[PDB]
Design a protein around this ligand. Structure first.
Ligand SMILES: NC(=O)c1ccc[n+]([C@@H]2O[C@H](COP(=O)([O-])OP(=O)(O)OC[C@H]3O[C@@H](n4cnc5c(N)ncnc54)[C@H](O)[C@@H]3O)[C@@H](O)[C@H]2O)c1
Ligand SMILES: NC(=O)c1ccc[n+]([C@@H]2O[C@H](COP(=O)([O-])OP(=O)(O)OC[C@H]3O[C@@H](n4cnc5c(N)ncnc54)[C@H](O)[C@@H]3O)[C@@H](O)[C@H]2O)c1
Ligand SMILES: NC(=O)c1ccc[n+]([C@@H]2O[C@H](COP(=O)([O-])OP(=O)(O)OC[C@H]3O[C@@H](n4cnc5c(N)ncnc54)[C@H](O)[C@@H]3O)[C@@H](O)[C@H]2O)c1
Ligand SMILES: NC(=O)c1ccc[n+]([C@@H]2O[C@H](COP(=O)([O-])OP(=O)(O)OC[C@H]3O[C@@H](n4cnc5c(N)ncnc54)[C@H](O)[C@@H]3O)[C@@H](O)[C@H]2O)c1
Ligand SMILES: O=C1N[C@](c2ccsc2)(c2cccc(Oc3ccc(F)cc3)n2)CC(O)=C1Sc1ccccc1Cl
Ligand SMILES: O=C1N[C@](c2ccsc2)(c2cccc(Oc3ccc(F)cc3)n2)CC(O)=C1Sc1ccccc1Cl
Ligand SMILES: O=C1N[C@](c2ccsc2)(c2cccc(Oc3ccc(F)cc3)n2)CC(O)=C1Sc1ccccc1Cl
Lengths: 329, 328, 323, 322
């Protein structure tokens, strides 16, 4: 008999219980993978990409670290059979933006990628929650929702989670306080058009807007509006300096994955179907504070916005619908 | 100011558990993320020669602060940023191209070390040095010679990764988690590494006793192939993704953990093995070491078979050959 | 209107089934140490507590709930009725007052049918003493396959042994390997042949290891394991922290399907000349289906005889039990 | 030669100073809950335990030591002699016997013994009445106010957030609310700062925390007080919730996180308080203890409860001999 048979007596012959799939093993996908592995959120990790060499190499590199991890099974493949029975599927797959090329071009190029991915994911994990990271995240969340046929609670966009995370870091740096104790919400459209909700900004329940009524206005001597401007600046700066962003997004995604996998019911700024709110009548996804758990977005926090903040959200929803109506599905 | 209206200042201290990472490439950054997610430091310093990459990497880590428990992340080309580090991790250096040997990088990484090591020692004279840059065994010796530090404070990542990979492969063959599969890969980190077949066990049950052909050419199960798979492992990963990062990042954080927490765990790491196995030269290679707050305080004297001791001295002879032809 | 309705807009109605639920039966010193350790290791999305003393039970549940801000287990429940334990992945039995096998078999006769009724697919983790007999009792009453009925067995004995080994060598217990097998407690067997640091056999280096002609008296380390148990009980009246931690470690392998090897009590019929339905500790592979595999340890004639003697004793008691 | 010498080659002799040492004084239900929580959060490289009951102390130490295989704290020590506490970064006082003079007398022995072995430590006071006993520890130690911290309203605040969470169907982490002033019966819920995702509950419901409230949110604070008495009535004491809240404070101190916590501090100069009185306000907590304070703007009613508490505490404090 084999050494295995000489050493081990088998009792049982024969599904993963807390499986997570990462689609796209680029810099974002891999940072999501390592963060999830170090937070023990899954009993099985699946990786999918179209570049087979890179995919196998990334899987092997992770597997070689098994001794230091508590995720006993790490798999990869171009075939979505490796994703079967995932509780959560994270989409970080995307086309590399060409020089000159417009952003509407990239939208459709990523829609074409999504037209192949989403049916393959839903076929192997029909009851999964979809977590969209790929840009433009608000449009691609809508695309994922339309293709999948899933109820809106199971289609989550990373949205303004990173924007809010960056805002809190910058707030923290200005005040000499840990970002955990600095509260502030960046809502609406992820990226350039995001809305800092000045009314909600506080340390220990002390409203910064109450203490300083000029907060977030051009009338502000301290120019706190620059803290939101810097959120936008930092994204461009990181890309200019290292060519991409990975660690910050990976960490923010693992945080969302934690609330879903552990059914924590924490409130996060994530992209959801906001039709019926703030005068929005189109099928658009934008970030609002959402209760996140085992069934995805179960609830949403109704944030009271100023006329300016509400108009900004409306304008973003009109822009997103404009792109969404002209997409080829 | 709004800061003064909101916060009243009471006090107008040195970092207590500071770690520096030198070299922010794929290895350095994987070491950084692994250390950050294991809460090993109250302060993380990053050093590199590439300005842009350094600032970008620091900023990317800082933007994830909300999800971390390391309140201070700093970077700079000037080593004043590294002052009073408990542990300095060196990952700076030229890496293998597809198929290239680690010994081929020695000359240019030794020059890189001639600049780094004096700068690190100047700002952290009492730190422990953790060397990752390849060839790791020779570069650990180089760091030891340049620094003038006692041998206990100069640690090379060594065969820690080789042993982790071996245990993973053992685990996959037996259907057991690597944590429960015990086996030691010693000597040089690389082509001349030694799998110690005598110490391979699950729950104290010797695999060599149960299968006397273990690690021999007479083996029908070809267990010797598990070690070949360990030797080839970096070459295969380099061929597929162009470098290795995750596995080494994880193994370094494991060593950082034993040092920062003074655990006194036994790890296969690069060390001054003069006086052991008939070695009379200042050779650095992997043996099981007790790792704590003062680095390597103790060494485990592994009993090697005639053939296993042979293979280890072959590894030591190779490394000394390269080591001896070096001007400081 | 409610402030909840003014603040929160509901999207989903029906709240689903718990995915990673753990139940602790008996909220004594052992049960509560098991509970806090599992909570601080984030092994469960829901924790259920059961006891017969209703006031203590509610107080313990409330004390844990008040620490929620510092935890990642969003639901903590308790009750005398086993409906609170429904759909548990793992049920830990620490129930009964801390000779006493007959009163403990009788409470198991009430507890086990109640646990299996609400969680038919759970793994059973038995801690209550005599753990080896009570694991057999749980197996018989539940009707579960042997893989889903685990006794804490020699896990604590082995942990204590490794601690003492570590202290003697100046090495962390994690790097000190040694297995204490068979019957939990006084009759446990230290397997001297498997004792090592970095794969270096202590018995090979010192052939007198675990013998009376040993000048270093390493046999005393096992003697100290037994002595320490009595000492802790003499000094504080019970043991809680060490058993709590060891149980959370078992819970981790099970919940995370790690397939790590642990010294736990299992049905060892067919091994070491044992022909009866007896549960004794051997190294077991632990995962989502409980004990899927067992490590066949090579024992000396003396070590094998000690297990056979323990098996004859345990079967003697077991034979006379009525279910 | 010994098996240890045959197996291990020693490189270093000198084995010195613990880098991240924590001491727990009083191994009762509170002390032991603090100990296990700190051990499971890997906050220390060394744990020291002190008590007057020698048998219980050794038994508790041994029970923790037997769990070493599952921990990352390589050294657990105990003793009646404070030599075991030398060079602690943090010293947690949970020792205890109206009741104030009995505890003051216990503190007159403890605090000098702690300060001589760990002159640079931060003192974390849990023993009740925590606000008076934090003042007592500060007076006896002679330490600057930044290094003398009372657990204060940390537990009150945590309980409040738990109850808020249960009412809203939201995790306590996402439910924000501050309970300040005097720990216990006289604690002040700051209704203005209560929010979920920056949405002020008082703005949405102006009747929040008043008797005019049809939803009776004032009852959530009443329930915080009710729950403390209930837990004591049901199990005889509280341990897990306090051990966890202390471990959270220990984390921000040991890791220099600079997180904001409701803890007891010397509040002379604030809210018209002119006496040396300790009570809870949101404090920035790090490696030097309380480095900063958040100046919370309070209503007339909230400020009145806090000043009233300060007058009462000073009344007791002036009538104490030490
Ligand atoms: N939401 C956020 O805050 C945030 C932040 C940073 C980046 N991003 C986005 O995440 C995406 C990925 O970023 P990146 O840096 O990792 O890009 P990347 O180019 O490095 O990686 C993308 C990966 O997607 C893969 N891919 C392409 N087509 C695929 C397909 N049909 N199936 C599976 N995989 C496929 C590629 O092969 C590649 O490996 C981008 O769209 C980016 O804009 C979002
Ligand atoms: N098991 C192991 O020990 C192990 C495993 C994998 C890789 N490695 C080694 O780690 C090293 C780094 O690998 P990599 O993939 O990160 O290479 P990399 O090219 O991605 O990064 C190397 C970094 O070193 C920096 N650097 C060069 N000179 C420097 C200087 N004088 N000061 C500071 N920084 C300087 C570079 O600028 C670069 O950022 C290599 O030597 C590699 O072989 C070791
Ligand atoms: N296997 C080991 O290594 C190990 C180590 C230590 C203790 N133990 C055992 O664990 C058990 C418990 O220890 P303890 O110190 O917590 O005892 P304990 O007396 O403090 O607590 C026992 C609890 O069981 C409860 N109980 C009694 N009947 C019950 C019933 N029908 N249903 C539910 N609960 C019931 C009691 O009310 C009590 O709360 C003992 O049998 C003890 O010997 C085992
Ligand atoms: N939110 C809070 O601040 C909070 C919550 C709960 C309890 N507490 C307080 O914590 C304290 C302890 O609670 P407990 O349940 O553990 O009490 P306990 O009676 O169980 O334990 C107290 C311990 O203090 C020890 N002790 C007495 N004198 C001592 C001395 N001179 N030196 C060292 N140790 C000594 C006792 O021996 C005993 O072990 C009480 O004052 C209690 O009110 C505070
Ligand atoms: O950090 C980030 N790096 C990004 C990136 C990552 C790899 S290439 C580009 C990045 C950065 C700057 C503009 C930018 O513009 C876009 C927007 C959509 C699109 F399809 C392509 C580029 N994208 C993607 C992204 O969304 C973020 S977050 C961010 C972006 C802008 C403002 C504020 C925030 Cl918080
Ligand atoms: O640490 C412990 N405290 C105990 C206890 C718990 C509450 S009151 C008594 C304790 C101690 C001594 C004998 C004792 O009696 C028994 C009874 C039945 C039985 F199967 C084993 C021991 N029980 C329970 C227990 O099993 C342990 S572990 C242990 C016990 C004896 C020797 C070695 C070890 Cl490792
Ligand atoms: O949970 C708790 N259990 C307590 C206890 C602990 C062991 S015996 C009594 C507890 C509870 C109720 C009143 C009570 O009264 C006292 C008695 C003596 C004294 F010096 C201070 C307070 N003590 C101590 C304590 O401070 C808390 S927290 C708390 C207490 C009251 C209201 C609100 C909160 Cl958050």
């Amino acid at each position: 008999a084999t050494l295995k048979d000489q050493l081990i007596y088998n009792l049982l012959k024969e599904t993963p219980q807390n499986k997570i799939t990462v689609v796209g093993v680029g810099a974002v996908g891999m940072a999501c993978a390592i963060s999830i592995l170090m937070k023990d959120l899954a009993d099985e990790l699946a990786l999918v990409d179209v570049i087979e060499d890179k995919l196998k190499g990334e899987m092997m590199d992770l597997q070689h670290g098994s001794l230091f991890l508590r995720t006993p099974k790490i798999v990869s493949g171009k075939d979505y059979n490796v994703t079967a029975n995932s509780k959560l599927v994270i989409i970080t797959a995307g086309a590399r933006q060409q020089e000159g090329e417009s952003r509407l071009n990239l939208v459709q190029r990523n829609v074409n990628i999504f037209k192949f991915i989403i049916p393959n994911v839903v076929k192997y994990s029909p009851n999964c929650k979809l977590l969209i990271v790929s840009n433009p995240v608000d449009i691609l969340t809508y695309v994922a929702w339309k293709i999948s046929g899933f109820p809106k609670n199971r289609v989550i966009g990373s949205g303004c989670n990173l924007d809010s995370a960056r805002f809190r870091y910058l707030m923290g740096e200005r005040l000499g306080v840990h970002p955990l104790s600095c509260h502030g919400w960046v809502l609406g459209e992820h990226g350039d058009s995001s809305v800092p909700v000045w009314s909600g900004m506080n340390v220990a329940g002390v409203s910064l807007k109450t203490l300083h009524p000029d907060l977030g206005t051009d009338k502000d001597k301290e120019q706190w509006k620059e803290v939101h401007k810097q959120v936008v600046e930092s994204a461009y700066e990181v890309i200019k300096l290292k060519g991409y962003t990975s660690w910050a997004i990976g960490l923010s995604v693992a945080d969302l994955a934690e609330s879903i996998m552990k059914n924590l019911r924490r409130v996060h700024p994530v992209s959801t179907m906001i039709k019926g709110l703030y005068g929005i009548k189109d099928d658009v996804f934008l970030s609002v504070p959402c209760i996140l758990g085992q069934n995805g977005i179960s609830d949403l926090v109704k944030v009271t916005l100023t006329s300016e903040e509400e108009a900004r959200l409306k304008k973003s929803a009109d822009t997103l619908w404009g792109i969404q109506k002209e997409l080829q599905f």
